[PDB]
Amino acid sequence: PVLRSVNSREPSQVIFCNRSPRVVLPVWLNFDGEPQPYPTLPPGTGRRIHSYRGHLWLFRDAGTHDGLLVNQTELFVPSLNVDGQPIFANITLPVYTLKERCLQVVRSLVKPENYRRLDIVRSLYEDLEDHPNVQKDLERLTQERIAHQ
Amino acid sequence: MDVFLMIRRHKTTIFTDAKESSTVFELKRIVEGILKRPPDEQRLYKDDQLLDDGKTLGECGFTSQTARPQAPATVGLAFRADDTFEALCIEPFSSPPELPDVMK
Amino acid sequence: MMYVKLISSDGHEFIVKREHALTSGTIKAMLSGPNETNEVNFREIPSHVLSKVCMYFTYKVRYTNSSTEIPEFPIAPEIALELLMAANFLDC
Amino acid sequence: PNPPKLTKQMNAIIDTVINYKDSSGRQLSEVFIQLPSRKELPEYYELIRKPVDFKKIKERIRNHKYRSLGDLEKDVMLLCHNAQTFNLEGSQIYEDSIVLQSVFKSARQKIAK
Ligand SMILES: Cc1ncsc1-c1ccc(CNC(=O)[C@@H]2C[C@@H](O)CN2C(=O)[C@@H](NC(=O)C2(F)CC2)C(C)(C)C)c(OCCCN2CCC(c3ccc4c(c3)n(C3CCCC3)c3nc(=O)c5c(Br)cccc5n43)CC2)c1
């Protein structure tokens, strides 16, 4: 797998800093590229955590799995600890498209079973049902990384 | 510091940004460039109160906390109509329909 | 700066920076082929929805490429479906 | 309290197992040092009736709970069997416990010579 943690033995202290209004789910990509859910971060909180250089992390809304950014990007990799200092992983909301933001709100208000009882254009039902998922986003990111290489 | 504004007259709304340190007159100059009416032919309001030309936007009450891009502050605009300033009039936007039952 | 006029189904006129309106591919397509030069009319987008769309163009322009904590774009339950319909049409 | 020669042997064997590094330089004992908490992984405590880790083993040498090399062997064999019970065959951790079990046997032979 292209997106996976490197089996490194280099310890790396990180500050997971939740600068978003959501409950954050940190996701560690294991050595076999499989996503591993870690303890959640309430909004406006930070935790000093133990990781390794070369380890791959993703951040999602814990409740919905909506995508979040870390240091203005999708993946976080602990790197060089300058003069002992822990690495800061600033977790924030992306500037979502209006469509994706609307989908989020409609999803929070309607049960999936009731999506097709809404009076909207047919393709919007498909978008409502295309729930945000770690595995889905990984597949897209894998293609994105392969195209660069 | 940037302030995000809705300048409203009747059925017209101008969406614009400005500096907190910028003045009412500079904002009247932005209105002139768009609606082709000189500053003296305009009256600007923050709710019921008429804003003075010299006063900064921050002095009027427009701060980053209240004039947000996703929630702009309303600046009322009145023009001199039939040789005299018309009463301040802003037409309301439409009303959202009854919320769907599956959304209830 | 250039300005464009976006007109709601109920005749409300929203004057926004050309740059903000070009966020939408649909708006771009209707500013390059249809009454005036930089005026676009939306026959099915009401003023309570169009106003929120203009707020969204502002929010997007301000918060894209910025080192600041990004606030949530708020959307009231009552405008949620109609805002979804327009955002879909507009591709925003 | 145990005789001083016995305590030295126990620590020498356990240090060999813990400081064991494979071909890649990876310390196989690393994940086995500390058990997962009962809060984070309650299934582990529902499945494994006698949980042990290398910190618990070190503490049992130190407090003279093991009165022989056989007593120490039983706990290392229990840690490895636990690892082999909870985790799937072929997983890194399952495989690491197989190697640690072998390293223990060799280290006990060396000290007995
Ligand atoms: C607080 C907070 N808020 C937001 S994020 C957060 C937070 C942040 C950090 C931590 C701790 N840090 C890590 O988990 C880091 C992160 C990422 O970089 C990978 N990682 C590791 O440490 C990995 N290790 C290594 O790469 C190396 F050490 C070899 C170099 C490892 C997962 C494979 C262990 C945290 O940890 C809490 C949850 C993390 N889990 C890590 C694995 C743990 C574990 C520990 C001991 C185990 C074990 C599993 N398993 C299995 C394997 C998985 C299923 C259970 C197992 N089976 C056994 O049978 C056994 C026995 Br016999 C004896 C002793 C331990 C044993 N263990 C359980 C907790 C919470």
Residue numbers in the entry:
A (entry chain B): 61 to 209
B (entry chain D): 1 to 104
C (entry chain C): 16 to 49, 55 to 112
D (entry chain A): -2 to 110
Question: What is the paper's account of this structure, in its own sentences?
Answer:
We aimed to achieve orally bioavailable molecules that selectively degrade the BAF Chromatin Remodelling complex ATPase SMARCA2 over its closely related paralogue SMARCA4, to allow in vivo evaluation of the synthetic lethality concept of SMARCA2 dependency in SMARCA4-deficient cancers. Heterobifunctional molecules co-recruit a target protein and an E3 ligase, resulting in ubiquitylation and proteosome-dependent degradation of the target. The synthetic lethality between SMARCA2 and SMARCA4, resulting in sensitivity of SMARCA4-deficient cells to loss of SMARCA2, has been discovered and validated by genetic methods, but pharmacological validation and exploitation of this synthetic lethal relationship has been hampered by the lack of suitably selective small molecules, in particular for effective in vivo use in animal models. We found that design of linker composition and exit vector placement could be guided and rationalised by ternary co-crystal structures, yielding molecules which exhibit high potency and suitable pharmacokinetic properties to translate to oral in vivo efficacy.
